[PDB]
């Protein structure tokens, strides 16, 4: 169908019951919940061929499901634990293996919400030596001190998103690798021609969308409540 999933992103504390919802418009008998993890592909949790027909997949422990309607298949994390952090995908199928996947739910389970923290973001300006040597100019964005690892980084030139000339690290690194709740860091590069960087009218912004707490989460610390938010850094072009 239009297969749709909710929510798209979610952060939760451990020990909570969390519900994901899949809905379809085509009324196919067969509906599925999978999880995706790096190096493991997509693993089946549970599936259903009709209202009240429910079948375990390979990783059903810790989850339950309900098939409330022809159109709806719900997944619950019964008592969330950190290793249920994953990208979750529901699917439908026709009678001939024609699958349709929802767009996914990115779920992160953390032990302690007190550790949630938005990134600090900085842009590092191109080197004069690069400009002289190559007639190109590389900007670097660094996002640091964030937790959990649940961000989206983009670049914006004169107010429009750019993809050309960009490379972002595929996963953040741990600032303190020995710690289970280490904060994270992420870098990205945007390379332009020297002459484009040398125009003082040109504006360069990296943007980091951070997913964290919501307005109904309790917050007891003096520091800023670490809500879902955008953090950016900027630089203007320059000749001198």
């Amino acid at each position: 169908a239009d297969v749709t999933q909710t929510p798209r992103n979610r952060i939760t504390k451990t020990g909570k019951r969390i519900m994901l919802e899949c809905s379809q418009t085509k009324g196919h008998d067969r509906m599925y919940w999978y999880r995706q993890d790096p190096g493991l592909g997509l693993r089946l949790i549970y599936y259903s061929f009709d209202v009240k027909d429910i079948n375990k997949g390979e990783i059903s422990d810790g989850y339950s499901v309900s098939r409330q309607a022809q159109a709806k298949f719900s997944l619950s994390l019964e008592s969330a634990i950190p290793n249920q952090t994953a990208l979750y995908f529901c699917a439908t199928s026709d009678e001939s293996y024609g699958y349709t996947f929802g767009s996914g739910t990115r779920l992160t389970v953390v032990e302690d919400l007190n550790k949630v923290s938005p990134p600090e973001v900085a842009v590092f300006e191109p080197s004069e030596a690069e400009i002289s040597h190559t007639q190109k100019a590389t900007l670097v964005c660094l996002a640091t001190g964030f937790y959990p690892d649940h961000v989206e980084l983009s670049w914006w030139v004169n107010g429009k998103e750019v993809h050309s000339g960009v490379c972002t690290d595929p996963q953040p690194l741990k600032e303190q690798p020995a710690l289970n709740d280490s904060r994270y860091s992420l870098s990205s590069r945007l390379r332009v021609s020297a002459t484009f960087w040398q125009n003082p009218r040109n504006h360069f912004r990296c943007q980091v969308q951070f997913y964290g707490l919501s307005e109904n989460d309790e917050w007891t610390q003096d520091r800023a409540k670490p809500v879902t938010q955008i953090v950016s850094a900027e630089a203007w072009g320059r000749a001198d």
């Binding site: 900085a122 590092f124 080197s127 660094l142 989206e152 000339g165 590069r189 332009v192």
Partner: protein, 202 residues
């Protein structure tokens, strides 16, 4: 006990060379077989499938796969590797007349053809008036690879490839930084085997 096996979690191909992603299955009766592609923060897209019709199956953008029962294989090929081919690829199989089961995935890395490398380590300063900086190792070819830091206060990223469309120009780079004030860009990549002609500006 039906299964699907992909060989290697990460594989490389030279830009312009034949793409080959391997998939084998363990079903006694031939199954239906599927190849899906996934881009970053994106969902799954079907490339092609074997549904007991033609053995040589054709997909979008020059992808093909031949079902070979005698070698229980369904390898995905494309004639030429393009930078836009960088993605994760999953082989999957029908099982128990009721579902699709997925292989573990293989990420395809495309090695750009860098005909005029210009390896260099540059220092970049924060746009704001801290004196914070980072070090950028850039413009090395395919034979250089970047090693992890051996010092827990120096952070080094993996090599990343950028494609500047404005100039039809691709380049590799890695970023290093540290909160030690004494940390110097000339030393940042000392744990990596770098080209003998790397440019170190003073």
């Amino acid at each position: 006990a039906q299964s699907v096996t992909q060989l290697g979690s990460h594989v490389s191909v030279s830009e312009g060379a034949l793409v080959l992603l391997r998939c084998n299955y363990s079903s006694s009766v031939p199954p239906y077989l599927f190849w899906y592609v996934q881009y970053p923060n994106q969902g799954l897209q079907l490339l092609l499938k074997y549904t007991s019709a033609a053995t040589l199956v054709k997909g979008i953008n020059g992808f093909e796969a031949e079902f070979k029962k005698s070698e229980t294989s369904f390898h995905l090929t494309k004639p030429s590797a393009h930078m836009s081919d960088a993605a994760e690829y999953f082989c999957a199989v029908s099982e128990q007349d009721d579902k699709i089961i997925f292989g573990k995935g293989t990420r395809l890395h495309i090695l750009p053809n860098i005909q005029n490398p210009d390896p260099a380590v540059y220092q970049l300063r924060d746009s704001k008036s801290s004196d914070k900086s980072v070090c950028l190792f850039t413009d090395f070819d395919s034979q250089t690879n970047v090693s992890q830091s051996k010092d827990s206060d120096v952070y080094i990223t993996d090599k990343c490839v950028l494609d500047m469309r404005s100039m039809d120009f691709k380049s590799n780079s890695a970023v290093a930084w540290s909160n030690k004030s004494d940390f110097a860009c000339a030393n940042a990549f000392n744990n990596s085997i770098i080209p003998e002609d790397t440019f170190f500006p003073s």
